[PDB]
Every structure is written in C-alpha cells, then in structure tokens.
Ligand binder design. Structure first.
Ligand code: MG
Ligand code: MG
Ligand code: MG
Ligand code: MG
Ligand code: MG
Ligand code: MG
Ligand code: MG
Ligand code: MG
Ligand code: MG
Ligand code: MG
Ligand code: MG
Ligand code: MG
Ligand code: MG
Ligand code: MG
Ligand code: MG
Ligand code: MG
Ligand code: MG
Ligand code: MG
Ligand code: MG
Ligand code: MG
Ligand code: MG
Ligand code: MG
Ligand code: MG
Ligand code: MG
Ligand code: MG
Ligand code: MG
Ligand code: MG
Ligand code: MG
Ligand code: MG
Ligand code: MG
Ligand code: MG
Ligand code: MG
Ligand code: MG
Ligand code: MG
Ligand code: MG
Ligand code: MG
Ligand code: MG
Ligand code: MG
Ligand code: MG
Ligand code: MG
Lengths: 142, 206, 58, 98, 171
RNA sequence: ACCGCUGAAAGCAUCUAAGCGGGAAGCCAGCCCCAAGAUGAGUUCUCCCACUGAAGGUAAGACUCCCGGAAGACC
RNA sequence: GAUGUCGGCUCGUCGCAUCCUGGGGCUGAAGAAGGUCCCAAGGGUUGGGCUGUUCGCCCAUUAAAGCGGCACGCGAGCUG
RNA sequence: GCGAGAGCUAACUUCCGUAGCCGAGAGGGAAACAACCCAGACCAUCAGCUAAGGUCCCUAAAUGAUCGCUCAGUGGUUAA
C-alpha cells in the first residue's frame, strides 16, 4: 500500500566544519547521511546523501580539546589498551576525529558500515571531488 | 643513508695490531643505479639498485624494459635505499671507509618448525622424577575461567628463523677496494652465498 | 508514517510537532491517516497543508 | 492517492475498485455515499470540511472473505500452546463519485 | 581600583578588537586582551574600563590594566634586572650575545637569550638583563637563577641586586 | 608531582583566575620486525594489445613435469 | 545425573597501597649516609640449608632481593 | 515499601505482621533486567487518543519558549 521509491539518485554536498562545534556538526552530517531530510521513504535503502567535510582541521571544541577528549583503542594484546591518542593529538590527523563522531551516530548494522562510504572528510580547505559538483549545506536548523 | 648490496662469502681469522679478530667477508659487488625515485614524482626519496648478473635469455620482457630504461645489463636482484641519492653507480670502494660502524642486514638462516625450548628458551620439564613431557613441552597456557582464553601474542612452537635481521654497529676491519671485498668484524645474519645489505649505522652512537 | 511526515514538514520549515498540531488546531482538517503519502507524492498539496497548519497557529 | 482512512470508510480523491470492511446492505448498487476529507482536482487541492461537503458516490461490488490466517499462540515451559483459525469479511466497492 | 594611564610622549597606540598594537621607540610590541572588556583611548591618557561588576570581569579588568601599563611603560622606559652571583669561584662572562656562567659545575653552563633580550656583564660577578617584554626578561632571569638556587646553608648561587636571603643553620 | 615568569578579584601578596617557560626509567615519536583483506584494498617502473565466434585459438606471462636447495611436516 | 583439593614445577599476564632504579617537597637536610611524604608500574626483583609445605628462620650475595590479583592463576600441562 | 525481633541499624540473611507484584502476567518504560514505574493481552486493520517514560544522532517525538545556576565532564560513584 505505502509508497517506496527507486534508488536512482545520489546527491553530494559540502559541509564547512570551520568554527562549528563538533558533535553538532556530527548529528547534522549523520542525519544527512541517514536520509532523514528527504522523506525517509524507506529504511531499507540508503537514500541519504554523500557529504564532503572541508576544513576538518579547524573544528572547534569546547571545555577541553585537551584533557577531556581521550579517544581510546584496544589492540587485542595484553597491555594493548594503553593507546589513548586523545586530545589535540588527533588533530595531527583531523580527518579521523570528525570521522569517528559521525560513525558513532550511524547505526551499527550492515547499512551503517555501508553508510561510512558516504562520508568524505578532507582536513584542508579544499576537496578534490569537484567532479560531482556538491554545493553546500551550512550552519544550524530552524 | 649510504648503502650497498652484497653476498656473504665466509668468516675467517685475521690479525690487526696483534689481536685476533673474526671477520665476515662480503662481496659488495658493483651496483647499477636502475630506477631513481624522487618525492616530486614518486612521493618519497629513494634509489633502486641491483646486484647479481643474470643472462638475458632468463629475463622477462617487462624486466628487460625496466633495465633498458636506464641502460643496465639486467641483474637478478633489486633493492631500494631511502635517502641515498648517488650519481653514476654504487661501488663498495667510494662509500665506505676503514672503521665506520655500519649496520648489516640479512636473512636469518632458517630452522623450520621449532619447539618452545629452541624458539623461545622455555625451561621445559624435568627429565626424571616420573613425568611425561620429559622435556620440550610448554607447560600451562592460560589461567582459567575468568581470563577465559589464551593470550594473543602467546609463545608456542612455530617457524623459527628465515627472518629479516639487522645487526647494529658492526665495524669495518678492511676494504680491499679493487676486488670488491669487505671484511667486517663479527657475524652477519644469514648463510654463505646469501644476500646482505650493508648500510650506515642507523643509530648515531656518540 | 511519522518519519516521512516531518521530513516533508521541515522541508517546508516546520517540524512534525508544530504541524500535526496545526492541522488539529485547524480542527475540521483531520485527514490524519497516512499524510505520509501526501507528503511523499504531491508536494504542491503538502505545501498547502503546511500553509494551513501555519495559518491555524497564528 | 485515494485511500480508505481505515477507521471505516472516509477518504481523499480518485476512482478505482477497492476493498473495505463490511458494509451491511448488500447486493450491488448500495451506491454508498461518501464524504470527502480531501480532494485534488486539476491538481486544485481543497481540504478539511470545506472539501467535506463534496460527494463521492460509489457502488458496492461484492461481499468477500479475505485470505485465511491462523491465530496461533505460545508460552514457555507452561504447556500453553493454542491454535485457532480466523478470516475477515470485507466488501469490494467501486469508486465513481464527484 | 586601578584606572589611569600615564602614557609618555614617544608612544602611539593602535586600537583593534581590544587586542591593541603599539609602535614607538621600540615598537610592534603587542599584547592580547579580552574583547568583553572595554579598550579605549580617551585621548591623551589611556583608560581601560570594566563593563560588569561580576567577579570575573573585574579580574580581567585589573589584569588587562596592569598589562597595558607594563607594556606601554616598557617601550618608553626600558627594562633591566641586576643579578649577582655569590660563592667561592663562581664566574660569568660573555661570548657574542651568549651568557657564560662557570660556577661550581664541572661543565660551563651557557645560556642563549631569546630575541629581544640583551645580556650584559658590567662586572665579572654581575649579570644584567635588559629588554622590552617584561615577561621575557622575567623568564630569562629566572632561567639564570635556576642554574643554582641559593642553598639554605650559605646563600651560594644566583640572586638579584640585594635579596634579603634567609640563612638556615649548619654544623 | 614539583619548580618558576608576567598578574588580577583586595591601590599589598599570590605559579592562576586569562595566558606563558621548566620538569621523570613513564606518554607520543626516534631503534628493530610484520603490515594495503588499510574491502578506505594505496603509489611507481616495465610489458602484451585491441582477435574470433558469456565463451574459444592466442599475446605478455605463468603453471604442470623433471633435477636439486644453507627453503621446508605438506604446501 | 561431579565446578578434582594443599604444595612444587611450567608458562605467563594484570593492579599499585613502589622492594630497586627515575623525578620532586619537607627534614631535627653541612658533606657523606639517611628519615618521611608527593609523582612515577618501563624494566629489573639472585643461588642455597631445614620443612610436603605456603609462610618463616638461617647461609652467601645483591640496586633490589615488593605486596596482591587472575576458580587462594595454571593436574584433557607434569608431578603427587 | 511500611511496622518489628534476631544480625553489625551487614547481607540478593533469617523470622512474624501488613499492602502490592512474580508465582500462573503477555504489552510500553527502567541500556540489558520475575519483583520497581504504567498497564491486566477474545480475534482482525498499512486508522485515531493517552499512561509510565520521553523528544541532539544511533532511536518514534520541541537543537521548545522564559527566568536563573553550575565551568566541575559536576551531570555520569560515600563520608568525617
Ligand atoms: Mg632449513
Ligand atoms: Mg632440562
Ligand atoms: Mg569472555
Ligand atoms: Mg498520527
Ligand atoms: Mg523464552
Ligand atoms: Mg514457570
Ligand atoms: Mg610573583
Ligand atoms: Mg605547563
Ligand atoms: Mg619541554
Ligand atoms: Mg625522554
Ligand atoms: Mg636507560
Ligand atoms: Mg571498490
Ligand atoms: Mg573469455
Ligand atoms: Mg607462450
Ligand atoms: Mg552435566
Ligand atoms: Mg564433567
Ligand atoms: Mg576439599
Ligand atoms: Mg601512587
Ligand atoms: Mg629519590
Ligand atoms: Mg646528603
Ligand atoms: Mg631464596
Ligand atoms: Mg605475581
Ligand atoms: Mg579464598
Ligand atoms: Mg589453585
Ligand atoms: Mg585446567
Ligand atoms: Mg602420598
Ligand atoms: Mg541487634
Ligand atoms: Mg530472602
Ligand atoms: Mg510452582
Ligand atoms: Mg498475578
Ligand atoms: Mg511484563
Ligand atoms: Mg518489560
Ligand atoms: Mg527494551
Ligand atoms: Mg538497570
Ligand atoms: Mg532481579
Ligand atoms: Mg516473564
Ligand atoms: Mg497523540
Ligand atoms: Mg506526561
Ligand atoms: Mg528523530
Ligand atoms: Mg534547548
């Protein structure tokens, strides 16, 4: 009875992270990935868009970009937790920090792993995906 | 930075100012500069270089084109040295001196599947006082319910040897420049006839 | 149903909450069952329903 | 577009024979009257009470008895297993009205 | 309370976002200040003013006012700390603009000034450090004092002009 | 941990409230070894070309098989 | 309708309330040698006599000869 | 939960009284979770309203409106 669509289209957009609080830029990108902005049409299908994050290096963070943000990874070996790259340090490779935030807000199933494909993070001002002319999102909601 | 390739000829005895000093002899034969790789073109700085000569009936057409691009009679072996940016070709003579420390890398003589007593120095069990596992065997492998498993990285019987091995800070006893020989104090990893790469000391030891 | 309806609603600048309110506050407007499909196929119509809800909330 | 608001019969716009929950009076030609809840004609939308004055004629087509299901139910470790049949009556009606 | 500035004659003070620039006898010196506070040139004499009587605004008011004072006075008037060494042996001299202290350590201790600082040796037993940035002159002289803190038992080590060093007991 | 420089809330004083320097066998990197199934599967050099009717003869190239090996249970 | 127990051996790995080594404050800290507290878990932490012993006492050395956890870690790994 | 004894004013302890739930109780909430919160499942529906509990993304629904508070990640582990 209820309408379900094609898969026909892919739409690209650049989000500028420059000076935005991370975490809020997080949920914005995570929803534009999930497909919640067009009608969700169907959960089965990733109708969501491709997103290009530029100036990922300059993301703002409150309270402590130090001290607070202790990112953590476990290695499989005894003593392999002590790997707490934390902090400002990961802004030595910024494209992962943003990329971690969005990935915690996509669902963990088989679609989410596939949705990871749709996030394209470039720490510098510029991006090379000029070919799929993306055009822009921006600041905040209503 | 500085490096060259060679074959491990053997190990003999030699006196220097009246003190016996075991030496490994290495043939550091001439090394053609085949491919030359810059960061500007290949994204990092290094130089490719070749060793044992190989008759051209034995050569792939693609490999013939690779050697022909530079103008080099084809060599059985090729390697790269980061940071080493020479000019011409790479003889033993010019780039080493008597008494440099130099790192010596080679491929360990390989010893097959070995038990924990050989591979990892385990104690092994008493050979008496009634006890099968009369030696050779690893003991316990875990704790019990609340570790639950055996550890990753654990130590147990395996393929010992046949590994890459560097030996730091070997001393250069003698260079017989014209014959392309080089004597080097102590024992390089490998086997006679094997490939070895001689290189600067990786550590700038004060 | 719901998850499509506010996606269209916000496409027109109001969320689900301040929409299905404003149809019910528009009282006799009551079509309710699967407004989803109206939002998903005719946007010329869902825009008019957005204008109706917003007029009712003023 | 047109669809029963399956609370009983009330609907939007466009004409095509469809199923519904039973309509009492039978045969055909019940001509059952329908009260608009929405309309899009010429893609000229009219809605809520203002449209509701609009008529929607529709004749009855056939009484029916849709596809069977089983009501089967189970609970654990308690011997509670019970099986029963069920089948819902319905009423085709062909849309026709303004 | 702390407000009025006594700006001299050779100075000029640029004004932007509260993070003002200065050029004068030894210009380009710049100090970074909060925007929520008011920065101002009333005209001849400088004046910094608090907005709110909240606990934190007054704190930044006092800090920014002392800092405009120190920075503006440091270009017109200069800076200098007169250190003296004490103890048997204990030598100091100069090589180029590098400080050579030779004081009871097996090695000599050399110190290379950061730029804008000037080491001086008016006496073989007197170090002197002139400069503009008060914070740099303070950190440089404090690095000289690190070389040996005066011991509790004899006062041996680096000092300022004439610190009333306290002295403990002994045997 | 601790040690300090400039310094306010208090015309004093204060390593702190903004900020700044020093400081460990520890942290990150540097040393050695593995590593693109890093499904995000990367880069560079060189070769064979554009056949016939998803296939089939073939290029470059490999494998099978033999004789061995400081490689190795078999692979 | 079975979760094999002390102790030894064999393998380890973790906590830190740190035995050694590293950095600091105070000392009734002159030096030297120490006391005590703070930070620190990288690595190291010996061989023997007696006893089933765990512990403990001794011998002889050590920078030091740490305390606990992991079914009082580990018997489809061994003893017994 | 409330009222008491025994207990250390311990215990997912034990023994009486009292109410409710589970026992034999599905459904929503409390991440997971017999007992706690809401609520007692005759069968069907691709219809609507609420309860507890919620409305940044996983994840249905205000990145709600107005006054303040805390710059501790307090929130998201006791006290003298
Ligand atoms: Mg072998
Ligand atoms: Mg033995
Ligand atoms: Mg487990
Ligand atoms: Mg609804
Ligand atoms: Mg069950
Ligand atoms: Mg039961
Ligand atoms: Mg002070
Ligand atoms: Mg600091
Ligand atoms: Mg430092
Ligand atoms: Mg270090
Ligand atoms: Mg060391
Ligand atoms: Mg692909
Ligand atoms: Mg084919
Ligand atoms: Mg061929
Ligand atoms: Mg059993
Ligand atoms: Mg059993
Ligand atoms: Mg027993
Ligand atoms: Mg501690
Ligand atoms: Mg000490
Ligand atoms: Mg002493
Ligand atoms: Mg002993
Ligand atoms: Mg232990
Ligand atoms: Mg016990
Ligand atoms: Mg045991
Ligand atoms: Mg066992
Ligand atoms: Mg017995
Ligand atoms: Mg009692
Ligand atoms: Mg009980
Ligand atoms: Mg029972
Ligand atoms: Mg009951
Ligand atoms: Mg229940
Ligand atoms: Mg439940
Ligand atoms: Mg649940
Ligand atoms: Mg819970
Ligand atoms: Mg329970
Ligand atoms: Mg139950
Ligand atoms: Mg409702
Ligand atoms: Mg409520
Ligand atoms: Mg939502
Ligand atoms: Mg809000």
């Amino acid at each position: 009875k209820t309408y379900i669509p094609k898969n026909d289209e892919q739409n690209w957009v650049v989000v500028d992270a420059s000076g935005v609080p991370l975490g809020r830029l997080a949920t914005l990108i995570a929803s534009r990935i999930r497909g919640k902005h067009r009608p969700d049409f169907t959960p089965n299908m990733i109708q969501g868009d491709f997103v290009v994050v530029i100036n990922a290096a300059q993301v703002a963070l409150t309270g402590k970009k130090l001290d607070d943000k202790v990112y953590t990874r476990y290695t499989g070996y005894q003593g392999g937790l002590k790997t707490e790259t934390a902090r400002e340090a990961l802004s030595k490779h910024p494209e992962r920090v943003i990329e971690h935030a969005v990935f915690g807000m996509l669902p963990k199933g088989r679609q989410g792993r596939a949705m990871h494909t749709r996030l394209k993070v470039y720490a510098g001002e510029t991006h090379p995906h000029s070919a799929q002319k993306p055009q822009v999102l921006k600041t905040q909601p209503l | 930075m500085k490096g060259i390739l060679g074959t491990k000829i053997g190990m003999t005895q030699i006196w220097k100012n009246d003190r016996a000093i075991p030496v490994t002899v290495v043939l550091a034969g001439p090394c053609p500069i085949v491919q030359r790789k810059t960061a500007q073109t290949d994204g990092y700085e290094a130089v490719q270089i070749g060793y044992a000569p190989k008759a051209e009936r034995k050569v792939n057409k693609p490999m013939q084109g690779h050697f022909a691009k530079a103008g080099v009679a084809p060599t059985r072996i090729l390697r790269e040295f980061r940071g080493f940016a020479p000019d011409g070709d790479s003889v033993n003579v010019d780039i080493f001196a008597e008494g440099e420390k130099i790192d010596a890398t080679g491929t360990s003589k390989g010893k097959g599947t070995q038990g924990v007593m050989k591979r990892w120095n385990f104690a092994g069990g008493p050979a008496s006082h009634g006890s099968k596992k009369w030696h050779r065997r690893p003991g316990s492998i875990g704790q019990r319910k609340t570790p639950g498993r055996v550890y990753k990285g654990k130590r147990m019987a395996g393929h010992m040897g046949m590994e890459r091995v560097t030996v730091q800070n070997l001393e250069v006893v003698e260079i017989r420049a014209g014959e392309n020989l080089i004597l080097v104090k102590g024992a390089i990893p490998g086997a006679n006839g094997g490939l070895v790469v001689l290189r600067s000391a990786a550590k700038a030891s004060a | 149903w719901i998850q499509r309806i506010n996606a269209g609603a916000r496409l027109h600048g109001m969320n689900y909450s301040t929409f299905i309110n404003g149809l019910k506050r528009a009282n006799i407007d009551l079509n309710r069952k699967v407004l989803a499909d109206i939002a998903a196929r005719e946007p010329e119509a869902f825009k008019a329903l957005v204008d109706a809800s917003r007029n009712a909330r003023q | 577009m047109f669809a029963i608001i399956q609370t009983g019969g009330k609907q939007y716009r466009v004409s095509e024979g469809d199923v519904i929950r039973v309509e009492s009076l039978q045969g055909e030609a019940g001509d059952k009257v329908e009260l608009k809840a929405l309309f899009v004609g010429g893609e000229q939308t009219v809605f809520g009470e203002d449209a509701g004055k609009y008529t929607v004629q529709a004749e009855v087509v056939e009484h029916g008895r849709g596809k069977k299901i089983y009501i089967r139910k189970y609970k654990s470790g308690v011997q509670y297993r019970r099986r029963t049949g069920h089948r819902q009556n319905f009423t085709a009606i062909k849309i026709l009205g303004i | 309370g702390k407000q009025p500035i006594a700006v001299p004659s050779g100075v000029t003070v640029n004004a932007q976002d509260g993070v003002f620039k200065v050029k004068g006898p030894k210009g380009e010196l710049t100090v970074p200040y909060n925007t929520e506070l008011t920065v101002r040139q009333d005209g001849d004499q400088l004046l910094v003013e608090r907005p709110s009587d909240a606990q934190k605004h007054r704190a930044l008011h006092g800090l920014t006012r002392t800092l405009v004072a120190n920075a503006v006075k440091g270009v017109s008037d200069g800076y200098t700390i007169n250190l003296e060494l004490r103890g048997v042996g204990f030598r100091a001299k100069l090589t180029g603009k590098a400080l050579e202290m030779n004081i009871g350590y097996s090695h000599p201790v050399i110190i290379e000034p950061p730029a804008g600082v000037t080491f001086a040796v008016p006496e073989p037993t007197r170090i002197d450090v002139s400069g503009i940035d008060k914070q740099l002159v303070g950190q440089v002289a404090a690095n000289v004092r690190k070389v040996r803190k005066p011991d509790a038992y004899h006062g041996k080590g680096v000092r300022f002009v004439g610190e009333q060093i306290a002295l403990k007991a002994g045997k």
